[PDB]
Symmetry: D4
Subunit: 160 residues, 8 copies
């Protein structure tokens, strides 16, 4: 089935983080595509990917990158689709450079930013699902079930 979410990332090394977004979309049965798009090495590829995303049937883009992380913001510059950004943890600055380079978008072009690292990747997929659930009743029911199960599955006390 045709992808409705695009997961894009700046490097193979980003996959260790972005795979959590991929896994969650699959769990919720959301058709998606997963690609490498390098903002600084393939900027024309980025422009083409972002500007054709809507006509290709994508509804949400999840973009992950680290360091001077320009991929999510430049994607949002070229699409009117919602773009969600995942700061990938960097070696020296522990993803603080990733976080600030993604979340601090000047007014006019948004990127909905999630936590540094694997939690952020999981949550980008969940946020994408909650967006799609607004106009996809079957997915909305699956998501409600997922959230309810998460709540019900919490233990009462730690293993001491």
């Amino acid at each position: 089935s045709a992808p409705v979410v695009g997961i894009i990332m700046g490097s193979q090394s980003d996959w260790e983080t972005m795979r959590h977004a991929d896994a969650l979309l699959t769990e919720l049965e959301i058709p998606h595509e997963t690609l490498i798009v390098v903002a600084h090495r393939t900027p024309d590829r980025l422009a083409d990917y972002a500007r054709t995303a809507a006509e290709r049937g994508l509804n949400v883009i999840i973009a992950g990158a680290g360091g001077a992380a320009h991929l999510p913001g430049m994607c949002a510059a070229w699409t009117r689709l919602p773009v969600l950004g995942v700061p990938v943890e960097s070696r020296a600055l522990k993803g603080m450079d990733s976080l600030l380079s993604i979340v601090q978008m000047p007014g006019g072009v948004p990127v909905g930013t999630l936590a540094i690292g694997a939690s952020g990747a999981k949550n980008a997929a969940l946020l994408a699902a909650s967006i799609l659930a607004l106009f996809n009743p079957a997915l909305a029911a699956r998501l409600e079930t997922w959230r309810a199960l998460q709540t019900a599955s919490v233990p009462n006390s730690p293993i001491t």
Copy 2:
């Protein structure tokens, strides 16, 4: 008509920031409500607001707060709707506390976070618009126009 976005904020002082979200939704003719909901001072108000949001017809919640900013995250805890978080600039730490307390959500409950301050409030409204545009064609066209005008209106050189 009935609101489809809720803008909520933790204090009157936050309005100086969140008014930019309100103005943008109004510009795009997106029906919305603008309220004060305080995580720490009105926690039952918050629970009720978030848990009933979907049944009231809300599709997106935009939540702004500063300092130890818990309003967006606790809102997300009680709703399946997408929650967008605006870190309000705090006096001492300039919204770095706001930013980290909003963006660093554990996996399982997302908050799509925007920039510290007025830019973030404006972008939360634009991100909400891009979400709604996925299933509202008239709005999608108005958002296209908005983004086109933003792009086209940029001068070629500074006034010196």
Copy 3:
């Protein structure tokens, strides 16, 4: 004997830190309970725990969490008991996100915050003990003995 301190934490992974609070309360013979309460996954459980704490006979709540650490602050929103917060060390940001999301409570709802990590957990228990000692003479004597022994046990010079 009935608990007079509640130790609550956001995850099993928090136990590695919060166990130091548990150990210290036991050492000083302070009856307590130890539970997992997840702010974002079980927000109604949190509300019920906090709002019934006083009537259940609890006098102090020690709450530990990491990342976007909302558990201590939201607990304090629902109880008039003193709430002590322990920032649990996070992977990327080394507990700085934990610290700011706990200590920077806006005026009106306090959380008495301790150091990041195991030291903070130990000190939360000690601070709880010093609070209870104000109206429990036997505990006050045990605590005085404990502090005096700590002082007397310091070596004069390092092992060189």
Copy 4:
């Protein structure tokens, strides 16, 4: 009547911040004393103040200081009473130095730390009140009223 909370601060300049603690204790009719005690300039005054606090009838000490802020921690070193620390906003580093030098106490000697600035001073007083309320029923009722009024007085919408 005899003071049961001591508010101490490192300079006249700190009074701009610590006056918020003083005002809150007065509002709740908690007898207190408000003094200047300087860790670095009057260290013997500090030692004497802290070591005699309990025998003078003090139950809680609230201590505020900025920069390399040692006043709360050294106070805690000489008393078994709970010590609450208020990081005062410093000129250059905006109280981040104040915050880390107060909150990061080694295990064995706690300081319950509140937010940087006026919010922290107000919350230190409220935290002191919640501690005293555990064994003072009339005060507990006044604190209940205070918190109820704070909750109830929050408007539903901002003034625009």
Copy 5:
């Protein structure tokens, strides 16, 4: 004569900073152009500007932006010319976001980064001059004079 340095910036507000680069190039009689090019609002303008810079006779590009500052890096992505980046001071984070989003470029696409603010803009122009001086002897002599005057003009004592 035809410009050999391009000064580009993300907004009219950035001109307050980038005017210092413009003034320095003018002082050294280096032909240049001064333009607004916005990474997020005019991304096609940016691509065209950078990709044609060399064929238009530009030798160095100086790019200034604030916040999630992507302009220098994306410029460097589309040109083989040296790109110098000026972090503009942002309101909340004082250009720390600007700095990290510019300097932390992944290996393969450089941006030579200067200090936050006016100093960085002036130094980007001086660095551009030092680059051009390598193959322009008249300019090299004017730059020698400029640096000599800067050194010689320093007073021996402050005015008190």
Copy 6:
């Protein structure tokens, strides 16, 4: 052949980082020299190296250091050549001290600064190459080929 780029560093421990600059210059067939120059232990050596660099035929200096990293800035004080600075990652502060001590040059004496660590060293060499390419056609062709190959070599999707 005579060196046209000087790579200098503050310690043998810096070589682990600076070797990436050396490797890249060699790959692009740029003659260079590689030396240790310690700002604080051999300050006269530094002065002599920098002030004679131009007459010795050097065109660019790449300087790497960590901690209180003064080598690049003091080199630039004594030469009119472009100086590029590489912040070497430090143990405690992860190169943040290195970065700020290099990039924050006051106006009047520039250092073109690259990313913390190995990426910065690689990019300093690439930036040096792009500078030399402005007046060396054979190198300009080699660099264009290098950048084109880098772009062409990017995979389309991650190894999943």
Copy 7:
């Protein structure tokens, strides 16, 4: 009489800060000289100043600078005298750049660093006085008096 402390600073703007060192030395009747010496603009002046300081009869150098602050460290590189460093508050980063670039000296060449700003300038002068007092009995007595007056003059309560 002949100066025994040198106060040096990187600009006229630094005088707003370093005047506090000058005032303190004057108060204690310590002969001193107050000069502008710029690490980056007058590096030969710096070398000459530091290398001849001891033979000129100087015993301590107090050096203040902001930003990438290299003046104290390079001074220490050329003298065996104790060098005390004052981080001047910078516009964007509030002297955090100043602080790290001064305090993080590699082993082998020390700079005794004081607080950011006016407090640091005053304390550098006091630290210089405490050094000189070790072998100057009249000064030691005046310093005793100074510290005694500082301690004694602290009021017991704030003016409200």
Copy 8:
């Protein structure tokens, strides 16, 4: 021979860092003592140590501690001797809490602060030596020899 420098530290775990100060003093034949003094556990021991240091013949105190590092500052409060502070690296915050709690002394009571960790400990000993060398000619000659050897021992190029 009677000690003229006191090395004090807050814990046995600090010895791993402070041993570098001890080693350097011994190398330069400076008689010294090495002790554990815990600011928060043995505050009276601290007061007695500091206030009797001068009469005991100490000339310089080197104090190391981590976290909320109050030992150097409280030592300086009780002595007129120069106090040098070594920030010991902490687990979570990498010695940034140590650094700020030591260097940011308010005006009136100085601590000459060295780098975080082993470099700072070595440099505290060297700074102490340079202070003592002002009135001890034999030590001054040993120190000059030491600095000259350090300069002469620097290699010309890295091992490649």
